[PDB]
Nucleic acid binder design. Sequence first.
DNA 1: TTGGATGGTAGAG
DNA 2: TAACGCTACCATCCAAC
Length: 341
Amino acid sequence: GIVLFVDFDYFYAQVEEVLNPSLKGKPVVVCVFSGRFEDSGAVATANYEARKFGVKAGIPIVEAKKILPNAVYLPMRKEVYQQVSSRIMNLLREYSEKIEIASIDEAYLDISDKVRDYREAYNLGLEIKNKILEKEKITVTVGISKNKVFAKIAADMAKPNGIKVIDDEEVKRLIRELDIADVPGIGNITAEKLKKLGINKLVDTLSIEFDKLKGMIGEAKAKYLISLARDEYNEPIRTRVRKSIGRIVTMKRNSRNLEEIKPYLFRAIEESYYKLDKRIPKAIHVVAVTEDLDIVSRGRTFPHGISKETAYSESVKLLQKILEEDERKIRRIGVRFSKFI
DNA sequence: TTGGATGGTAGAG
DNA sequence: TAACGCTACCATCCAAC
Ligand SMILES: Cc1cn([C@H]2C[C@H](O)[C@@H](COP(=O)(O)OP(=O)(O)OP(=O)(O)O)O2)c(=O)[nH]c1=O
Ligand SMILES: *Nc1ccc2c(c1)Cc1ccccc1-2
Ligand SMILES: [Ca+2]
Ligand SMILES: [Ca+2]
Ligand SMILES: [Ca+2]
């Protein structure tokens, strides 16, 4: 069982550095500007130079500019990053047929039949890094271990431009020593609940009553953590199948005017339908983000596919439903399609 | 004598 | 002053031959 994981370094920011080499080695911040006012929106990512000053994914641009006014702030050019991603993902395909594309910049390869051992796996990781750097001038981090979770943890430890093997002995050390927060899938909310059960390390999960852990974090996550801690997790590398395709836009001003909201919604539908690429959806959900950033959605599922024209009229009724059942003003509006034929 | 649809939550982007 | 995107999972529920 040998899994090689690839995660591209500071991805959007690094693509902008390849396009404009004068950027390299100084703070670069990639932003989602939203329209609302001067510099409204959020950071998508930033290069490591900018991160030293606290700028990173998620924070508002106005806050980034407070702690790092000097940097290059660039509008996110998603189309260009997807082009670069697709070419790299096709390079990776050449090293293994068992590949799992996990995100715009992540893929797992099952190389159990390609290499005899970790030493050979490591050499293959360098070949992959070299090839990607040659073809795309993009640095990446490679993580290598016995399963997906530890391969991803290996890349986290080695980031940026790194390569790391976590061998059987180091897996045992991490079960003992790794802060549970740093386990994939364990976020702030789950971690804090675990903090209450005395669980700080993966190994702590072995001594706890299974139903107290279940009653706290739910069946799936409890099973997940115990399996990892047991050194048994062995989930297969499988092709990811798109389940939903959606778009959400920020309105210039908050509104409850249907006619004022509709153009944004239709734009979201038009854009969603372009990305569907031959897929035919049987479900549609409208999403409204209210003034206080609560997320509200209403959907409808048909026994048959939804035509683009049908989506327009159905989305209107879903938005009328939200507007009738929630009095708060809408700030963001979007649509999602799912249950593809 | 359990299940698809429903809307909300949490997080490996 | 807080984007954009998408999966897995969770409760809840109104239907159950
Ligand atoms: C986390 C995050 C990522 N992204 C996008 C931009 C990132 O470049 C891309 C990949 O996500 P990540 O791999 O999480 O981040 P990264 O590649 O920018 O940085 P790192 O070196 O630490 O791996 O996805 C967002 O748009 N918003 C986000 O909140
Ligand atoms: N990024 C993003 C885009 C569209 C949608 C979400 C996120 C959540 C959601 C829920 C219902 C419909 C559409 C969307
Ligand atoms: Ca990355
Ligand atoms: Ca990533
Ligand atoms: Ca975490």
